[PDB]
Amino acid sequence: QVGIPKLEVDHISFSNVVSMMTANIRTGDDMAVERVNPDDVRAINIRNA
């Protein structure tokens, strides 16, 4: 038979397998971008959806 899920029954259980990252997720290399503006505001195409 397969094992009964721990949430499915009323028993408390004090040892469990917890997944975890081996080291911190926030490495500190936050993403940064090169925004570049439209050259001329009059030429911008508002149209087409």
């Binding site: 050259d39 001329d40 009059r42």
Partner: protein
């Protein structure tokens, strides 16, 4: 003897700086006559032609 190149220019003496024209670049160039809006500074220059 020893002329390198002989060009046909617009006559600076007729089209004087009093006309607001500047013929030093090879073309007439009047500042601040026609000039596009909504463009980054220094984008105006082709209009000077």
């Amino acid at each position: 003897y020893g002329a390198a190149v002989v060009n046909i220019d617009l006559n600076r003496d007729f089209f004087d700086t009093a006309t607001g024209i500047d013929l030093t670049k090879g073309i007439p160039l009047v500042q601040d006559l026609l000039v596009p809006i909504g463009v980054t500074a220094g984008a105006e220059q082709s209009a000077e032609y």
